[PDB]
Amino acid sequence: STITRPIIELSNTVDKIAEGNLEAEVPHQNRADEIGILAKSIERLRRSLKQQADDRTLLMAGVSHDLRTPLTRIRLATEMMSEQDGYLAESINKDIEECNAIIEQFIDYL
Amino acid sequence: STITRPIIELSNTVDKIAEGNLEAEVPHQNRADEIGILAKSIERLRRSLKQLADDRTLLMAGVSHDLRTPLTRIRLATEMMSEQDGYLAESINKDIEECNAIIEQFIDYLR
DSSP states (O other): OOSHHHHHHHHHHHHHHHHTOOSSOOOOTTOSSHHHHHHHHHHHHHHHHHHHHHHHHHHHHHHHHHHHHHHHHHHHHHHHSOSTTHHHHHHHHHHHHHHHHHHHHHHHHO | OTTHHHHHHHHHHHHHHHHTOOSSOOOOTTOSSHHHHHHHHHHHHHHHHHHHHHHHHHHHHHHHHHHHHHHHHHHHHHTTSOGGGHHHHHHHHHHHHHHHHHHHHHHHHHO
16 A cells, blocks of 8 residues: 555654654654644644753753742842741751752752 | 554554543554554553653652752841841842742643
C-alpha cells in the first residue's frame, strides 16, 4: 500500500512528540486527503505544545526574577536590625533561605 | 475507503487533545493494523499529558504548602521586633505579602 507508510510515519511523529520532541517536522501536511488532515491536526497539537512550553519557560524566569527582589529585601532588612533583635534576624534569615530552596527546587521540577 | 472515518475520527481526537481535553476516549485502539497503532500512539501522548498536568497540579499544592510555614514564621518573628525596629518590621511584612501575591499569581496562570 501507499497509505500504509504515511500512517506509520505519523504514528512515529506522535511517538516523538510524546517523548518530548517538539521540533521534529510533521510530514504529509500538503496532502489534500484525510491523511493530510490528520497531519495538519498533529501539527496543530505540536505547535500548541511548543507554545505552551515556551510560555511556561518565560513565566518561570519571570517569577524567579520577581521573587528575588522582596526576598533579597527581607535579607537586607535583617542586616539593618539592631543588636537586640539579632536573635530574630537570624531566625528570619534562616526562613528566607528556606523559601529560596523551596522555589529553586520547584523551578527545576516544573 | 473504509479507512476514511477512523482517520478523521483520530484527527478529531487530536483536535480535542490540542484543545485541552485529556479525558476523551481515543477510539480504535483494538485494531490489528496501522490505524490501531496510530491510535495507541495517540493514547500514549494523551496518557502522558494527563500525567504531566497531574504532576504539575500536585507540585504547586506542595510549594504553596511548603512556603507557608517559613513565611508565617517570619511574620511572627517581626511581631517580636522592638519598637525601635518597627520600620524594618513593616518592610519585611510588606515584602512577605508581596511574595504571597507573586506566588499566588504564578500558581494561577499554570492551571
